[PDB]
Amino acid sequence: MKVIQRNCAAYLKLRNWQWWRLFTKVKPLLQVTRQEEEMQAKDEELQR
Amino acid sequence: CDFSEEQTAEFKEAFQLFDRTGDGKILYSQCGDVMRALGQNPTNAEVMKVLGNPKSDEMNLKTLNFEQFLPMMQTIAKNKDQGCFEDYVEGLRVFDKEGNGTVMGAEIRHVLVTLGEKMTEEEVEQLVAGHEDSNGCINYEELVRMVLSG
Amino acid sequence: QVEEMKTQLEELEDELQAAEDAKLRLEVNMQAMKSQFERDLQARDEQN
Amino acid sequence: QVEEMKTQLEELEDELQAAEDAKLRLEVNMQAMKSQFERDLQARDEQN
Amino acid sequence: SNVFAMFDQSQIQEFKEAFNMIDQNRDGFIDKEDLHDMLASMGKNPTDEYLEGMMSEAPGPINFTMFLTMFGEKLNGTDPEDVIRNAFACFDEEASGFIHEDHLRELLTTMGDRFTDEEVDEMYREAPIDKKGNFNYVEFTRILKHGAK
Amino acid sequence: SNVFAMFDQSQIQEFKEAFNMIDQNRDGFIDKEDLHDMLASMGKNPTDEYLEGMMSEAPGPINFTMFLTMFGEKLNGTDPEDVIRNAFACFDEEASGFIHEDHLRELLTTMGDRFTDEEVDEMYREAPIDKKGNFNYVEFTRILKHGAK
Ligand SMILES: [Mg+2]
Ligand SMILES: [Mg+2]
């Protein structure tokens, strides 16, 4: 847990300041993530 | 020669299609299988007229080129005609014990293996399409009417 | 050479026409195989 | 004209080779259809 | 610029697709002019900060490979979502995806680490927070790895 | 003859899209600066004359058009994985994916055009031969056509 929380906190601090700020503006146009979400939802319901 | 140019060409195509061991000349025993594939029904005695190797011939040393093959195909073709389905089913009407126009599968398959030339169950089973299911009494009309298409 | 090329090109044109005719026939025969497949499948299902 | 006819004959030869390749492919695909037909037919018969 | 093997196919595809929208003239580079056009398409006249934040790192124009290593080094420090979820599940009192925020805070301040209360609170302002304080780490790992579900 | 005319729209698009990732300087050619750096970014950096010896396959320069004809002539004769699997299934009638090495040998060493003993051995020392001499052609076609691979 010590190593995991160290890593996650370190990344979380940086992705709130770095080029993620630009990336997040483009992100909603990336249709692949939407089709992936749909696929995952279908797989989840199939599993249920 | 009674065969047409088209027939000769087709026979030459078949001759080189049903190959090979390695050489372009057909084997003595396999020649008979080529004649049978060409839809003819001669007895093995027709080959025995040429009498290549009087002993057991696993070696097949009496190989044939097309010029040697074609005369054998001709003497086969001119050997005999073949009778209608009535001549076949009369045999079945004699073999039958029910008197109903059908025959027991287990009996007939055995009879057709023992009498005359020998055949395997693998050969014989492939001839029947109306298989011996819940009903033992196969209608031999289907057998003859199917195979006579060849 | 002109005569030779004329003969050769006419032969190749004839062969090409034959090949196209054969292509069409193979297509229609494949459609026949497909049709028979569907019909026989349905027949086996209905008989079962 | 000889050069033109040479180019045309080479193009027709290429097209003929393509057509023969296509014929072979259609034949093998028809054999695939036949194989599937036989396999499915046998499966339905065995299930029956 | 060694990068292709270091990150997931989905992440690389996401970066590639994003880059394709920014590389407006379509040549595999991204320039100051491309960022200017992009920012003009996104909003007002350039605040410079976003563009200078690339131009200070780069020797000049940025290759797609250089873009990939830049975003790569930025993503360095992330771990697999299932592995992180496992690590949290060691401490989740509900044993379901929903460790309590006080417990999580204590763990960030006693087990060798000494994370500041402001930074801990930021992780509830921007990263998840849920009813009764039962922080949804199952959602946290999803946004950390960018592996949508 | 002009081989380029033989190929499917999907194959041409795949080659075009691949080439677009390699043509990083956007001059349309295969060049020392681009593919060597790309391969160094994607793997172990074999930037030695081994790559020059690959670029030298084209007559002098190496344009996109020349790349396309090179890959075209190399793909000449190849067929779909499903069609090849069908052709194997003509012997493996049970569709077991389990054809024997004796059967495979009989089909190749005398029947039709002869495969050499060296080519037969290649089919064991690279291709998926397995226990008791069974041969998994379903895996073979996958690696042969580079489909789903
Ligand atoms: Mg650009
Ligand atoms: Mg280039």
Side-chain angles (χ1 to χ4, degrees):
Chain A
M1 183 63 177
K2 184 173 72 174
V3 175
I4 289 295
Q5 78 192 1
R6 195 167 281 181
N7 288 0
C8 80
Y11 173 66
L12 181 62
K13 187 67 178 171
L14 293 172
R15 73 139 278 269
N16 271 288
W17 198 262
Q18 298 302 122
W19 305 275
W20 190 90
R21 277 188 296 129
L22 182 55
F23 184 73
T24 196
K25 297 181 179 74
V26 176
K27 185 174 177 182
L29 300 174
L30 306 174
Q31 300 306 328
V32 175
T33 64
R34 220 283 96 188
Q35 298 170 291
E36 176 63 23
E37 182 197 42
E38 190 69 15
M39 192 281 301
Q40 288 290 340
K42 256 63 191 172
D43 190 48
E44 177 62 20
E45 289 300 328
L46 177 56
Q47 182 61 20
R48 286 171 194 194
Chain B
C1 185
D2 288 6
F3 301 125
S4 71
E5 182 60 26
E6 295 180 357
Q7 285 173 331
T8 298
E10 191 168 25
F11 295 163
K12 193 168 184 178
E13 183 62 26
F15 175 97
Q16 218 75 79
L17 175 61
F18 308 140
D19 238 357
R20 54 171 184 159
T21 50
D23 201 349
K25 310 170 193 71
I26 63 175
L27 302 184
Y28 192 65
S29 291
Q30 192 252 9
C31 185
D33 297 335
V34 171
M35 302 296 183
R36 276 154 177 163
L38 292 169
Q40 311 304 302
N41 71 317
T43 57
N44 297 338
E46 175 64 24
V47 178
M48 204 62 71
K49 296 302 191 78
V50 177
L51 225 173
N53 192 349
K55 303 179 183 178
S56 184
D57 193 23
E58 296 296 331
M59 297 182 290
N60 285 270
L61 296 169
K62 196 73 176 179
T63 59
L64 302 92
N65 217 66
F66 189 68
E67 292 94 332
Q68 294 163 308
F69 164 86
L70 189 57
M72 191 180 291
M73 180 57 181
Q74 192 144 225
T75 60
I76 284 161
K78 303 286 285 196
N79 193 287
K80 63 186 287 301
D81 296 330
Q82 191 63 36
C84 61
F85 75 94
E86 259 290 308
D87 295 334
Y88 179 93
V89 301
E90 178 61 8
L92 279 288
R93 287 192 293 249
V94 171
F95 286 152
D96 180 32
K97 56 182 176 184
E98 302 299 324
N100 65 352
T102 62
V103 73
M104 288 289 189
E107 281 92 314
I108 195 63
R109 77 182 170 92
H110 184 70
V111 167
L112 292 174
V113 164
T114 57
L115 297 185
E117 159 66 342
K118 305 293 170 272
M119 291 177 74
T120 70
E121 295 295 324
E122 190 184 350
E123 283 180 293
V124 173
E125 188 169 315
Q126 290 180 74
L127 303 177
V128 177
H131 182 67
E132 191 167 27
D133 59 17
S134 303
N135 173 34
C137 302
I138 299 169
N139 191 337
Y140 49 76
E141 291 287 337
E142 81 88 14
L143 176 54
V144 66
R145 288 171 194 264
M146 194 173 77
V147 301
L148 284 181
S149 69
Chain C
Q1 189 65 228
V2 169
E3 292 278 24
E4 178 61 27
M5 291 300 285
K6 192 169 182 293
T7 300
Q8 292 289 346
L9 86 83
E10 284 174 20
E11 289 274 29
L12 286 165
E13 185 179 10
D14 190 39
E15 285 291 327
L16 181 55
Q17 190 170 12
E20 284 290 296
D21 178 47
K23 190 181 74 183
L24 290 166
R25 279 173 214 248
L26 285 168
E27 171 58 29
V28 176
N29 289 341
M30 188 272 292
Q31 295 300 336
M33 288 259 65
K34 188 181 179 181
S35 186
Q36 197 206 318
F37 169 45
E38 289 291 336
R39 189 54 254 272
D40 287 353
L41 175 147
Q42 186 267 355
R44 289 288 94 177
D45 283 348
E46 187 58 35
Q47 181 156 117
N48 180 239
Chain D
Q1 293 291 289
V2 169
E3 192 176 333
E4 178 61 27
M5 290 183 179
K6 190 170 180 293
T7 300
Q8 189 167 18
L9 166 140
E10 285 173 20
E11 189 180 330
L12 287 165
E13 185 187 346
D14 189 39
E15 194 68 34
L16 180 55
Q17 288 282 0
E20 191 61 28
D21 182 47
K23 278 165 68 186
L24 290 165
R25 195 169 287 111
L26 285 168
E27 171 58 28
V28 178
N29 270 255
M30 190 157 70
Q31 293 181 0
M33 182 63 66
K34 187 168 174 289
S35 186
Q36 288 287 114
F37 167 45
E38 287 175 24
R39 189 51 39 203
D40 176 88
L41 174 143
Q42 285 179 22
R44 289 181 200 286
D45 283 349
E46 185 58 34
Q47 285 290 338
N48 181 61
Chain E
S1 46
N2 208 323
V3 68
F4 200 98
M6 302 296 295
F7 299 97
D8 295 342
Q9 195 78 351
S10 55
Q11 293 168 334
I12 295 170
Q13 278 181 13
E14 281 165 30
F15 299 157
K16 191 265 184 180
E17 190 176 24
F19 188 92
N20 189 70
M21 299 297 291
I22 305 163
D23 181 12
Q24 177 262 108
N25 83 260
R26 297 180 277 95
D27 69 19
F29 295 104
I30 198 280
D31 300 347
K32 184 173 182 68
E33 186 64 39
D34 293 317
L35 298 167
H36 172 69
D37 188 32
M38 188 80 272
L39 195 43
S41 186
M42 288 173 171
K44 63 171 187 180
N45 61 296
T47 58
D48 294 332
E49 188 262 315
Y50 291 109
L51 299 83
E52 287 189 343
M54 287 197 176
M55 293 299 95
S56 67
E57 287 298 316
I62 293 164
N63 191 319
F64 173 62
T65 59
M66 187 188 295
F67 183 85
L68 280 183
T69 47
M70 189 186 295
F71 269 36
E73 184 57 33
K74 173 202 77 180
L75 189 53
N76 189 17
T78 204
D79 285 304
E81 51 176 308
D82 284 324
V83 176
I84 300 165
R85 279 193 286 265
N86 188 273
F88 273 75
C90 297
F91 288 99
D92 185 3
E93 55 265 274
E94 293 203 47
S96 60
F98 298 93
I99 196 170
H100 182 53
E101 61 95 55
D102 197 43
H103 192 39
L104 188 51
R105 178 170 44 250
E106 284 288 312
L107 294 163
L108 287 163
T109 62
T110 61
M111 308 196 303
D113 297 328
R114 302 286 286 172
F115 279 104
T116 309
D117 62 338
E118 168 64 7
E119 300 301 333
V120 172
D121 195 48
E122 188 63 35
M123 187 179 70
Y124 310 141
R125 289 169 204 160
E126 197 269 326
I129 191 66
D130 311 77
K131 198 177 181 180
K132 300 185 179 180
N134 70 354
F135 179 86
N136 188 337
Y137 66 85
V138 175
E139 282 287 287
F140 188 40
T141 56
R142 283 166 187 180
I143 65 171
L144 283 167
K145 209 207 181 200
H146 308 285
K149 301 289 176 296
Chain F
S1 308
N2 178 40
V3 69
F4 150 74
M6 278 292 297
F7 309 101
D8 296 341
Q9 195 77 351
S10 55
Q11 294 170 330
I12 295 170
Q13 187 62 15
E14 184 187 344
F15 278 130
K16 190 192 177 182
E17 190 65 26
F19 197 90
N20 266 286
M21 299 297 290
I22 300 161
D23 185 24
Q24 293 181 359
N25 83 347
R26 204 65 269 265
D27 73 15
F29 309 146
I30 286 288
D31 213 357
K32 181 64 174 69
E33 274 66 40
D34 293 355
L35 44 145
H36 293 236
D37 278 14
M38 184 171 171
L39 284 164
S41 291
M42 293 172 72
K44 302 296 185 182
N45 188 19
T47 188
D48 292 334
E49 67 265 41
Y50 296 109
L51 285 179
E52 289 175 14
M54 186 192 71
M55 291 201 299
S56 67
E57 284 274 301
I62 177 163
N63 197 356
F64 173 62
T65 58
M66 297 169 182
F67 158 86
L68 193 50
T69 48
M70 190 190 296
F71 257 96
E73 186 57 33
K74 285 172 186 181
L75 283 179
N76 189 18
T78 305
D79 286 302
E81 54 176 308
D82 285 324
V83 173
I84 300 163
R85 280 192 286 266
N86 136 76
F88 278 114
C90 297
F91 333 109
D92 186 2
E93 58 106 354
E94 293 277 43
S96 61
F98 212 83
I99 298 170
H100 202 259
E101 62 170 63
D102 274 326
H103 305 155
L104 186 53
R105 275 189 293 261
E106 283 185 314
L107 293 164
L108 300 169
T109 63
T110 60
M111 193 193 301
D113 302 80
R114 169 168 158 77
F115 273 45
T116 71
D117 294 16
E118 168 70 349
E119 291 171 322
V120 172
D121 193 49
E122 292 264 63
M123 291 192 75
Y124 307 142
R125 70 210 198 192
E126 197 152 29
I129 192 65
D130 188 33
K131 289 185 78 64
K132 300 180 181 179
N134 92 84
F135 183 82
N136 311 129
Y137 69 83
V138 300
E139 172 65 2
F140 188 43
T141 55
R142 197 184 67 94
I143 65 171
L144 187 152
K145 227 281 187 155
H146 307 285
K149 179 261 194 171

